Point group: C2
């Protein structure tokens, strides 16, 4: 995915969630930039901390409304299901390129 | 770790957990064999499903009391912290050989 700074991007988590209770994290270059427990609220961390232009969309997807060059990197979601037969996995990885 | 079948082994999750709300998973060869949400109960899955000799110890460690040859593989814990500044990471990877 390639964009100019100031554009927006929505990153899609394409991992199936069937459990009633589950956790979602968004990762940037292998570091968690957001965590969420089902029924709770998103907590943005590391590079996405203090960012007013980031949103957790439909309790799943990651929106960066005001892309910076520093937002460049690899992004993916990780899901952990809680309970019997609970599964765990990663969504598709996306390489974000941002130009001036 | 190299053990004869019938021996026991305790796998240690050495990830520091300071957060109040968190999730612990144990992985075997990259596949989750147990999940746990703080305040909840462990759920054993995949190869550890329906094992009466497996236990979640002191709310973090993995005990297999009656090792089978099929139990061999690589094990590690993953922790996800929930909330502001929440981190996530893996414990040390352990390699288990079980022989007849």
């Amino acid at each position: 995915v390639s964009h100019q700074q100031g554009q927006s991007h929505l990153f899609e988590c394409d991992y199936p969630i069937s459990a009633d209770t589950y956790v979602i994290n968004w990762y940037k270059d292998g570091t968690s930039v957001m965590n969420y427990l089902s029924g709770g609220e998103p907590a943005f961390t590391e590079d996405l901390d203090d960012r007013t232009d980031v949103q957790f969309v439909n309790n799943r997807n990651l929106e960066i409304t005001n892309l910076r060059v520093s937002d460049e990197g690899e992004y993916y979601c990780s899901v952990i299901e809680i309970g019997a037969g609970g599964q765990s996995g990663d969504g598709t990885r996306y390489q974000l390129v941002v130009f001036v």
